[PDB]
Write a protein that binds this DNA or RNA. Structure first.
Ligand SMILES: Nc1ncnc2c1ncn2[C@@H]1O[C@H](COP(=O)(O)OP(=O)(O)O)[C@@H](O)[C@H]1O
Ligand SMILES: Nc1ncnc2c1ncn2[C@@H]1O[C@H](COP(=O)(O)OP(=O)(O)O)[C@@H](O)[C@H]1O
Lengths: 669, 791
DNA sequence: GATCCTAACTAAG
DNA sequence: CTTAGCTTAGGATC
C-alpha cells in the first residue's frame, strides 16, 4: 500500500530494496535464491515495484503489481553509494552496515531516485538504511565475535577464548562442529531444549562414551576425500577403526533414555558390510601414500595374492638362488642385489669376478665388485620385474574398486559423521557442565536476563584467585545498568560475562551461573577496545562512532548491547555529552537490555533523570598506598575512580604520582 | 618449593632475574615456562604448549630450536625485553636431579646511544685481532672484572673506529694480518702464532673455561674470526696470569649494532608489515613490496623490521638506490625470470628438489649474464660488488640446459624429466620404449590384415598387459591363435605370444628408463651441490638487488628523496607525507614540516578529531624507520638525528583477564616509556589518561609530559584532546604548541591537514561523528547537552 | 631406572 | 593450500 520497492540482478545473486514513504523505514535485502525473493515480495506486498530492464528471471517479477521497467543507470554501483551518502550527509555507509552489500545498494540508488520522482518533497524520514537478516540465529557482527573473544582473542591467539574452555571435544571433527555452533547461535527454543536434555542425560555416561568417541578419528574430512576418490590408504584404515568402534558407541547410547540420543544412536548406524570390506581389503597399518603400494590386504582379491605370491616366491628364490649359485659357482663372495637402474644382479668380488662363468654377463660394472646376470636369473628377474609392476598396478585398480563399493553409502556415512560429530560436542558439553559446575538455563517468553552467582567462564578458570559471584537482573522494567566503579574494579568483566552466559545459553550449552532465566535475544552488540584505520581514512574516534552508529541504527528491544566507556578520544565535555545522548537513545527509544560501563561519573545521575534505568557500583577501599577491590556488584553509584592508586599498582613512578596528586589538589580547589 | 626438581631449579634461577625473560636449555630446545611462555608466545610467534603438571595445574611452555636462538634472540631484544640465556653448565650425564643451569649472558635491549660505550682511559684491556678473506675478527678481555667483549668488523672504518673506541692496553695480532696500519697505533702490540687463532682449538678452549658443551648460548659459536681471536686471547690470559679466572665465565658481542628498539606494540601500531586488522594489505611493506622475485619480498620485510643505526650500511643502500634508479626498467624484468632462487636452493640443500624447480634454476643462470652486463654500466662501489657477488655459474647453466627438458613434469616418477642426450643410455632405453608405440600400430595393422578384422584395435591394460580388443560381432571370427584373457559386453580382448614377449620388453624398458632418470636426477644434485655456498651468496645478492631496484622504482614513481644524518639528537622534515595513506587514498596527501631538536623537544599536537594529529605523529616514525632501513624517505629534505627507541602508545585494548583493564595496560606501557626512555629516544603519545576519570587522567598526563621533558629530555610529540596541557610550554622550557587545524564552513567541516604553530582550542567531535554516521537525533541531543555542560 | 609427550620447520598431492 | 612428516632433555618409584 506504501512499500515502494526495487529489484536488480547480478550473475552471483539478486538485490531487493523497500522504502516506506509513510514510516521513513528504508530497508535492504540480498536474496540469491528465487523462493526467498517470491516470499519477501509476498511478505512486503509492494504498492509499486521497480524492475531492471536486463532482468532474466521475469517469471518472479511478472506476478507483482505496480510493475515498472527501469533503466540500468539507476542501478549503478558507484552512483548509489554517493547518492545515499549525500542524502544521509555521511562519507561512508559502514555505520548503517549496508556498505558491504552492493546489490541492495544498487536497488536503493534507483529507489532513492524514484523517491525523488514520486515525491521530490522534504526527506528527513530517510536518515538511515538497515539490512534485515533472515538467519533466525543471533546475528553477531565480526567486531563482537572478537570483542567477546568467542573463538579469537584481541591478540589473535586460540588461547584465552570461550572456545578454549569449552573445546575439550576428543575428535577433531567435533572441534569444528562446536566452533560452527558458537558462531551460529540457534534462536529456536525447540532445538536448544533437545541439546539441553541430551547434555543432562549423557552427564551420567560422559566418562563411558568420551573414550570410545576419540577412537572414531577425523571421519568428516576422510569421507569428503573419499568422495573425490583421493582418500589415501591411512585414511581408509581410520574408516575401518571407526566401524570397529561404532557397535560399542550404539550399545552405551541404548542405555541412555533420551529420544534425541536414540535418534543419534540410530542415525550413527552400523555399516557392518563396509566394516567387513575395509577389514578384509586393507592391511592393519598401511603407508599414507597409495602410489607406493602395500595398501591392499591379502584376502580381498585372489589375483593380488597370486602375483604377490610370485613376488614373495621371488624373494625366497632370491636367497635360494643365491645359495645354489654360490655353491654351484663355488664363490663365497657371490651376493644377489636389486639396483633399480640395472635391476636384480649377482655382485661378486673383482678377485672372483673373472672366475664367474660365461652365463654370468656384466650389466652393472664397478672396480671393487662386478654385478652379473645369469640367463636363468634373467628369466626369473624378468618374472620378478613384471610381477612387481603388475602387483603395484592391480593394487591401484582394487584401491579404485574399493571406492566404487564404499561410494553408494557415502550419503548415509555423511549423516553418520554429522551425528557422531554432534554427539562428541554434546558429551563434551555434558563433561564441561559437570567438571566446571554449570547449570541448565530456562527460556522465559519476554526479553530479559536474570543471573544468580554469575561468572565469566574464561577469567575465573585462567586466574588462580577466587571469582566473586555477581548477580544480574536485566528486564523490560530495568533495561540499563551504568556500571561505574574504580579502575580494575570489575566493571568491564561484569559487563562481558552477561553476553558469554547469553551466547552459551543460545547454542544449547549449560551456563557458568547457579541459575539463569535467558529471554529471547536477536543480536549481541559491543563497543570495546580502540584502533585507527588510517589506511581506510578513519581516525580512532570515527571507528568508535561508526560502531556506536551500527548499535544505534540496528539495535532493537530484543538486542543485548554491551557498550564500554565511550567518548574517549575527544575532549572531556564533548565525550560526556555524546555518551549521555547515546545512552538516552539506547534506553528512551531503542529499549535494548544494555550495560553502559563509564569512568565518567556525571552519567551516574542518568537513572534519576530517565525511567527504566538503574546504577550499580563495583567498589574498592584505599587502605594506605595499595587499593583493595571487593569485585562485588552492589546497588548505588561509585563517585571515585582511584586512578592515581591503580596507576601506582601499574608501575608509574612515585615522582609522577606525587606531582599528579599535588595537581589534583589544585584542580579540585 | 614443592615443584618437580627441574621446575624448582627454573624458579630459583627465575627468582634472581625478576622481569628478564629467561631462556632455559631443556636438551635440544630452549623454552620459557609459566608467565615467560605467554610473554614469548605473543612476541616470537612460537606455539604455546602445556607440559606435565608440577605441584598444581600444567606448566605453560613455549620453546625454540638451539641453533635458531640468535634469530629469535634478536626479535626479543629489538622489542626491549632483555633475554637471560641459561646453558646446561653441568653434564646432563651423572645428573639424577636437573642438569645444572646458570645465566651465562643477559643480552639487554642493547641501548648504546651514549657515545662513550667503552672509556678511552680504560686499561688492562688485553685484546686479540686476526683477519681472513671475509673481514677482521677482534676480541677484548678486561681480566680484572673478567668482562669479555667480541667484535667481527666487515670494513676498515669500523675496525679503526672500534680499535680507537676500545684503546686496548695490550693487543695480540696474528702472523698473517694484512691491514697492519690500523693496529700500528694500538699499544702493547704482540705478533702471535696461528694455532692460538685456530677455529677448532678456540671453540673447545672457550667451552672448557665456561664449562659448557656449545657456545650457541653466548651467540658466538657461528662467528669464526672473533672466536679465533678469543682463543688466542684466552690462551694469552693463561700465559699472563698463569691461572684460570672465574671472572671470565662468558663472551658477549661488542659489535651488536643497535637496531632502533621498537616494542611489538609499535611494530603493529605503525603497521610496518602487519596492520591492526592483521591483513598484509594497507601496510608499509605493501607499498614497498612490488619486488618481482619471491626471494626479494622476504628480504625487504626482513629489512623493515631491523632498522640498523650503522651509517656505513645505510649509505651503501642510499647510493645503490640512487645509482640503479636509471636502470630500474632495464633490470626489473630480467630479475623476475630468476625465480625464488632462495627456496629452490633450500630444496637442493636437503637434496629434495622437484625437477620443475631445477628448470627454474636453469632459467635464472640463462638470465644472470644479462643482469651482470646491465650492472657493469652502473658504476658504483656496492653495485659492482653485488654484480660480482651475483656471479655467472656458467657450468651449472650448461649442465641444467643439457640435463633438463625445456618444460619437465612435476615429479621424476612421472618420467621424461631428464633431457635426452645428457646420457647415451637414457635415450637408448627410451628409444626401445618409443619402439613400442610404432610396434603397437605395426602389429595392430599386421593382426588386423592377418585376421581380416577391420574393428580389431590393440590396447594395453596395466592389470592384463597388451591385448587385441575386437567387437563381439568379429570376436567369434578371430582365429584359434587368439586367446581370450579379458571379457567385456561390447568387445573381447585376446592375447598372442608375440604380445606377452613384446609387452615384457615394453614394461622392462619403461621401468629401466624411469630408474635411470631418478639416478641421473640424483647425480645432478651431486654436481650442483659443491657451488651451493656461492649460489646462496648469489641468491642473497639477487634478493638484495631486487629490493634495491623496487625501492629505486618506487623512489622515482612516488618521488622519494635521499635523507641526511645530523648525528645530533633532532628530526628536521620538510614536505613529508605518510607513505601508506597517500598511496592507498585517491585524495592528495598534504605535506607537513617537523622540527624536533634539543631546543624544541616536545610538541603538544592539539587539533580537531581526524585533523591529522595521529598521522603527523606516526609520519615522523615511518619517515625515521625508512631512513634507517637505508631507503629513500617520502619527503623533499630529511635530517634524521640519532634514535635508539621509537615508543608508540596510541589507543589501548584490555585482555579483561589476568589482571588487565583498559587503564592497567595504558599506565604499564607509559611506565615502560617513563623508565626505559632516553634523551636520544623518540616518544609518541596519544591522550594518555583515556582509561581513567577526567581529573585523574589530566593529572597523570601533566606529570608524564613533565618527566619526559624536564628529566628524560626525549624528542616527544604529545597528542592530547585535553587543552589544559597546552599551558605546559610556558611552565617548562623546550615545550611548544602545534595545531593540525580544520574549518567548519556550514554544517560540514574541512580538515586542512597542515602542521601550523599555535594551540587549537576546540575538538570538532560532534561534527566528525556526524560524518562517521551517528544518527542526527543522537548528535542533536549531544550538542544540546554540550551547550549545558559548557555553561 | 624408566618411560611418554612436548617445543620450529616441509611440501606432495 | 595443506594435512601429513619434522628434536634432548626431563619424571618417577622403588
Ligand atoms: N567478579 C570478579 N571476581 C573476581 N575478579 C574479578 C571480577 N571481575 C573482574 N575481576 C578482575 O578484575 C581485573 C580486571 O578488571 P577490569 O574489569 O578489566 O577493570 P575495568 O572495569 O576498569 O575495565 C582482573 O584481575 C579480573 O580477574
Ligand atoms: N595530510 C593528510 N592528507 C590527507 N588525508 C590525511 C592527511 N592526514 C591524515 N589524513 C587522513 O585523515 C585521517 C586522520 O585522522 P587521525 O589523524 O587518525 O585523527 P585522530 O588523532 O583523532 O585519531 C586518517 O584516517 C587519514 O586517512
Amino acid at each position: 500500500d506504501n512499500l515502494l520497492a526495487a529489484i536488480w540482478q547480478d550473475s552471483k545473486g539478486f538485490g531487493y530494496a523497500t522504502l516506506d514513504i509513510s514510516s521513513g523505514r528504508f530497508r535492504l535485502s540480498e536474496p540469491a535464491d528465487r523462493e526467498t525473493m517470491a516470499a519477501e515480495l509476498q511478505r512486503t506486498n509492494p504498492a509499486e515495484l521497480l524492475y531492471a530492464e536486463d532482468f532474466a528471471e521475469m517469471s518472479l517479477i511478472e506476478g507483482r503489481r505496480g510493475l515498472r521497467r527501469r533503466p540500468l543507470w539507476e542501478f549503478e554501483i558507484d552512483t548509489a553509494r554517493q547518492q545515499l551518502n549525500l542524502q544521509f550527509g555521511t562519507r561512508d555507509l559502514v555505520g548503517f552496515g549496508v556498505e558491504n552489500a552492493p546489490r541492495g545498494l544498487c536497488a536503493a540508488g534507483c529507489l532513492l531516485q524514484y523517491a525523488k520522482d514520486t515525491q521530490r518533497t522534504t526527506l528527513p524520514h530517510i536518515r538511515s538504511i538497515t539490512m534485515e537478516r533472515e538467519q533466525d540465529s543471533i546475528i553477531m557482527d565480526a567486531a563482537t565475535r572478537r570483542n567477546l573473544e568467542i573463538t579469537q582473542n584481541l591478540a589473535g591467539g586460540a588461547e584465552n577464548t570461550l572456545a578454549s574452555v569449552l573445546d575439550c571435544t576428543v575428535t577433531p571433527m567435533g572441534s569444528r562442529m562446536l566452533k560452527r555452533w558458537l558462531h551460529m547461535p540457534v534462536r529456536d527454543t525447540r532445538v536448544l531444549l533437545e541439546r539441553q536434555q541430551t547434555i543432562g542425560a549423557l552427564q551420567d555416561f560422559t566418562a563411558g562414551l568420551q573414550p570410545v568417541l576419540r577412537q572414531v578419528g577425523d571421519l568428516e574430512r576422510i569421507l569428503a576425500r573419499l568422495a573425490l576418490r583421493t582418500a589415501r590408504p591411512r585414511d581408509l584404515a581410520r574408516m575401518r577403526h571407526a566401524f570397529q568402534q561404532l557397535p560399542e558407541l550404539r550399545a552405551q547410547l541404548e542405555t541412555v533414555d533420551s529420544a534425541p540420543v536414540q535418534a543419534l544412536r540410530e542415525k550413527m548406524g552400523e555399516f557392518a558390510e563396509l566394516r567387513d570390506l575395509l577389514e578384509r581389503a586393507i592391511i592393519d597399518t598401511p603407508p599414507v601414500l597409495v602410489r607406493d603400494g602395500g595398501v591392499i590386504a591379502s584376502g580381498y582379491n585372489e589375483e593380488l595374492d597370486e602375483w604377490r605370491a610370485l613376488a614373495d616366491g621371488a624373494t625366497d628364490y632370491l636367497e635360494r638362488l643365491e645359495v645354489r649359485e654360490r655353491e654351484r659357482t663355488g664363490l663365497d663372495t657371490l651376493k644377489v642385489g636389486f639396483n633399480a637402474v640395472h635391476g636384480y644382479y649377482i655382485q661378486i668380488s673383482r678377485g672372483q669376478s673373472h672366475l664367474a662363468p660365461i652365463n654370468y654377463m656384466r650389466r652393472q660394472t664397478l672396480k671393487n665388485a662386478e654385478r652379473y646376470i645369469i640367463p636363468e636369473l634373467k628369466e626369473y628377474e624378468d618374472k620378478v620385474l613384471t610381477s612387481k609392476g603388475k602387483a603395484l598396478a592391480l593394487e591401484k585398480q582394487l584401491y579404485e574398486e574399493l571406492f566404487d563399493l564404499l561410494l553408494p553409502h557415502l550419503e548415509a556415512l555423511q549423516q553418520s559423521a554429522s551425528a557422531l560429530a554432534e554427539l562428541d560436542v554434546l558429551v563434551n558439553l555434558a563433561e564441561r557442565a559437570y567438571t566446571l559446575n554449570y547449570t541448565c538455563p530456562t527460556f522465559i517468553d519476554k526479553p530479559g536476563i536474570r543471573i544468580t552467582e554469575g561468572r565469566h567462564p574464561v577469567v575465573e578458570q585462567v586466574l588462580n584467585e577466587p571469582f566473586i559471584a555477581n548477580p544480574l537482573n536485566l528486564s523490560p522494567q530495568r533495561r540499563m545498568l551504568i556500571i561505574t566503579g574504580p579502575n580494575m574494579g570489575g566493571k568491564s568483566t561484569y559487563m562481558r560475562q552477561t553476553a558469554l552466559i547469553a551466547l552459551m545459553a543460545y547454542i544449547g550449552s549449560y551456563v557458568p551461573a547457579q541459575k539463569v532465566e535467558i529471554g529471547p535475544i536477536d543480536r549481541i552488540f559491543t563497543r570495546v577496545g580502540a584502533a585507527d584505520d588510517l589506511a581506510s581514512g578513519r581516525s580512532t574516534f570515527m571507528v568508535e562512532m561508526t560502531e556506536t552508529a551500527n548499535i544505534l541504527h540496528n539495535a532493537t528491544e530484543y538486542s543485548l548491547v554491551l557498550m564500554d566507556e565511550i567518548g574517549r578520544g575527544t575532549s572531556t565535555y564533548d565525550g560526556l555529552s555524546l555518551a549521555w545522548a547515546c545512552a538516552e537513545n539506547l534506553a528512551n527509544k531503542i529499549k535494548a537490555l544494555t550495560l553502559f560501563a563509564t569512568h565518567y561519573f556525571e552519567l551516574t545521575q542518568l537513572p534519576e533523570k530517565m525511567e527504566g534505568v538503574a546504577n550499580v557500583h563495583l567498589d574498592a577501599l584505599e587502605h594506605g598506598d595499595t587499593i583493595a577491590f571487593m569485585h562485588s556488584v552492589q546497588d548505588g553509584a561509585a563517585s571515585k575512580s582511584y586512578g592515581l592508586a591503580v596507576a601506582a599498582l601499574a608501575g608509574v613512578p612515585k615522582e609522577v604520582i606525587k606531582r599528579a596528586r599535588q595537581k589534583l589538589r589544585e584542580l579540585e580547589s
